[PDB]
Amino acid sequence: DETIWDLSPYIKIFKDGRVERLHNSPYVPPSLNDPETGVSWKDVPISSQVSARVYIPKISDHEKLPIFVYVHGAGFCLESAFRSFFHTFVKHFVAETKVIGVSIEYRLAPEHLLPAAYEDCWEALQWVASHVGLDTAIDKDPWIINYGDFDRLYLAGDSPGANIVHNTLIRAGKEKLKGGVKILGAILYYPYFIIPTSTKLSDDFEYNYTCYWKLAYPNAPGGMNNPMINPIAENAPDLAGYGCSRLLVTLVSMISTTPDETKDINAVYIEALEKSGWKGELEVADFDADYFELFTLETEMGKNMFRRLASFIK
Amino acid sequence: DETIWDLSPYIKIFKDGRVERLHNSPYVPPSLNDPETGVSWKDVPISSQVSARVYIPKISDHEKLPIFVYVHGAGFCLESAFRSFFHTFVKHFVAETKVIGVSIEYRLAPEHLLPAAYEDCWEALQWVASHVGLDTAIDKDPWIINYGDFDRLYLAGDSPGANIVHNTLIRAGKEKLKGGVKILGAILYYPYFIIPTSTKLSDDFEYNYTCYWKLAYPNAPGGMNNPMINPIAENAPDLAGYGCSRLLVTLVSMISTTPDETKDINAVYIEALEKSGWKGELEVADFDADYFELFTLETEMGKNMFRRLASFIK
Ligand SMILES: CCC1=C[C@H]2C[C@@H](C(=O)OC)C3=Nc4ccccc4C3CC[N+](=C1)C2
Ligand SMILES: CCC1=C[C@H]2C[C@@H](C(=O)OC)C3=Nc4ccccc4C3CC[N+](=C1)C2
Structure with a gap:
């Protein structure tokens, strides 16, 4: 039938309400001691509408690890913390950086319009925070309680996930x-x-x-001048308020074989943050690379970007 | 292309290796305090190849609950502990009987031929057993540790799942x-x-x-006289050895609108168990009912069979 949005090969949204997800990577179930990476993961509930994949790497000491909260992207409308495209990335990242991973399963559009995703990711972050100093209610993760270092909490995302993180x-x-x-x-x-x-x-x-x-x-x-999409809109919140001490912004130049055109947008954003009076450590990493290469890790440029993000965690 | 097995509308296995399962029930993510039932569930790893959906109902006392280990059926080759067909059943059963639910995600044929399923379900059961007297390693479930009563452990399955339980x-x-x-x-x-x-x-x-x-x-x-499919074959293990004290066998008469023909087979099985010298409590429940009605819970006969299984748990 007729479509409203034909975004082949990613998503089709039909006049009759049907949503075809053309790019839907397969589900990968929970696993203990992954043969390749030694990472283990489980899918845990935060509310009746929000869940997360929690990751722990091969353990040596009793020693506490940074907490890496990830918010996947893909159009606010595609993929999952539980499917291979983002899971494979987070798994490898956890193995390499030796962190507790929390990849948030938030509600997707168009079935759940924004600000559902924003609410879900806020609820998930508060859930992570709620474990501080618990050395237990049915919702609390013993991995986070036992191994999570709240002095080294990181929040990361890509594409619309990065918008959610913002x-x-x-x-x-x-x-x-x-x-x-x-x-x-x-x-x-x-x-x-x-x-x-x-x-x-x-x-x-x-x-x-x-x-x-x-x-x-x-x-x-305000449409595309809504402060949540346009961070320098008339009514936008002051970027000086950003609730982190350190920020890494990583930019790429290609979407598959298509020239990316977000250079100017991201420049205005960065200039605004730098001009804001936010007194944190800003890190920018600008690659001649395909957005997709970070996740697939098949190419040298993909591996370079992976290692750059890994370096931000200490 | 040509197929080896055309079992439309459930599974097609192609000469070229492809497996189509077109009518698989949708995935249902983990949830805390389900609005309908008050049940919570999470997906946890047992090994690098085996996982389980663990269920806990609305909690009143500190009081410990029976442990209900479920092994879904559907052809040894269809569905999932994580998809709505079996999940909806186990959720409702957990709410009604007030048990800790452990629904095993075992590897399916034809990608993983038998005895993979048997190995997986044995590993999952040993994983459940491994929690006894822990009042913990990263693989241990705090729901089972805190609320699981090892004096009231039940193991249940349907169709090939019931074969796995056998x-x-x-x-x-x-x-x-x-x-x-x-x-x-x-x-x-x-x-x-x-x-x-x-x-x-x-x-x-x-x-x-x-x-x-x-x-x-x-x-x-032995083909269809393999002891694991034919429990009275020449070389079959003695049924006296069954490692439970109580057994409920529930029989139905219809597969959707098709007359079922397993009455004679199940009679021979039950006669063999009774003649074995197994000194346990045997319960048989023989309904004029559709196999499917137990799971869907839309019909009075469905609700009767549900309540019969619920009565077996005390
Ligand atoms: C033309 C702009 C464009 C952006 C890219 C980045 C990001 C996205 O949504 O960006 C807005 C995606 N991550 C994915 C991960 C997996 C499947 C699809 C996506 C997208 C949408 C498709 N796309 C096109 C990729
Ligand atoms: C005509 C024999 C026959 C058996 C029935 C019981 C059982 C099964 O596998 O039994 C052998 C199934 N449970 C399902 C649950 C969901 C989708 C399919 C099934 C099947 C296979 C289809 N079928 C055919 C149903």
Whole structure:
């Protein structure tokens, strides 16, 4: 039948409400002592609507590890913490950086429009924070209680996930987290913002980039000038409020074989943060690379970007 | 392309190795305090190849609950502990009986031929047993440690799942479980055995019943007289060895709108158990009912069978 959004080969949204997910990587079940990596993972409930895949690496000491909270991307509308595309990345990252991984399973558009994802990821972060100083209720993860170092909490995301992390950092700034937990550092791989710049995006890229915000938040107050998509809008929260001490922004130049056009947008964002009076450590990493190579880890450039993100965790 | 097995609408196995399962029930993610039932569930690893959905109901006292280990059926080759068909059943059963649920995610044929499922379910049962007297390593479930009553352990399955439970009971008999854990009671809902009787199965029913054993264990030693499918074969293990004190066998008369033909097979099985010198409590429940009604819970006969299984747990 007719479609509203034909975003082949990623997603089709039909006039009749049907959603075909063309890029849906297979489910990967929980595993103990993964042969390749020694990582173990489990899928745990946070609420009746929010869950997470929790990861622990091969253990040596009693020693506590940084906590790496990941928010997957893909259009606000695709994939899962539980499917191989993002799971394979987080698994390898956990093995390499020796962290407790918490990959959030948040509700996807169009079935659950924004701000569902924002609410879910905030609820999940507060859930992580709620374990501080518990050395237990049925919802509490013993991996986080026993091995999570709340002095080294990181929050990371890609594409719309990085947009969620942005909005979560603003919120962590205004509201604070349970137990006085502070986010030490955050990572945005391929930020997802929409900002008017002096050079217009090309017609095709504008359509295939802005569509995700349009289908995920059709009734957004201010549309693509909503502060949650445009972080320098008239009514936007002060970036000085960002609730982390360290921030890594990683930029790429290609979406598969398509030239990316977010250079100007991300430049305005970074200039705004630097001009804000946020007195944190800013790290930018700008690669001639495909967005996808970070996750697949088949190419040298993919491995370089992986190692750059790994270096941000100490 | 050409197929080896066309079991539309459930599974197609192609000459070129491809496996289509088009009508698999949807995945249902972990949830805390389910609005309908108050049950919570999580997906936890047992090994690098075996996982389980663990269920806990709304909690009142500190009081310990029976442990209900479930082994889903569907052809040795379909569905999942994590998909709605079996999950919805186990969820409702947990709410009604107030038990710790452990629904085993075992490897499916044809990707993992038998005896993979048997090995996986044995490993899962030993994993459950390994929690006895722990009031902990990263693989141990705090729900089982805190709320699991090892004096009231039940092992239950349907269709090929019931075949797995049969073979697991024989094994529990020969090998014993960690910590001296004994299975108190077991349930076979719609047993899956192949036994020669005096009345031949009809052509169509024989094909659509035996196909699951043939595709799951091609060239099993003895074929359909393999002791693991035919529990009264010449070389079959003694049924006196069954490692439970109580057994419920529940029989039905219909597969959807198709007359079932396992009455004679299940009669031979039950007569053999009764003649074995197994000194346990045997319960048989024979309904004029559709196999499917237990899981869907839409009909009065479905609710009757549900309540019969619930009565077996005390
Ligand atoms: C033309 C802009 C564009 C962006 C890229 C980054 C990001 C995304 O959603 O960006 C907004 C995605 N991550 C995925 C991971 C897996 C399947 C799809 C995606 C997308 C959407 C498709 N895409 C096109 C990729
Ligand atoms: C005509 C014989 C026959 C048996 C029935 C019982 C059982 C099964 O595998 O029994 C052998 C199934 N449970 C399912 C649950 C969900 C999808 C399919 C099944 C099957 C296979 C289809 N079928 C055919 C149902």
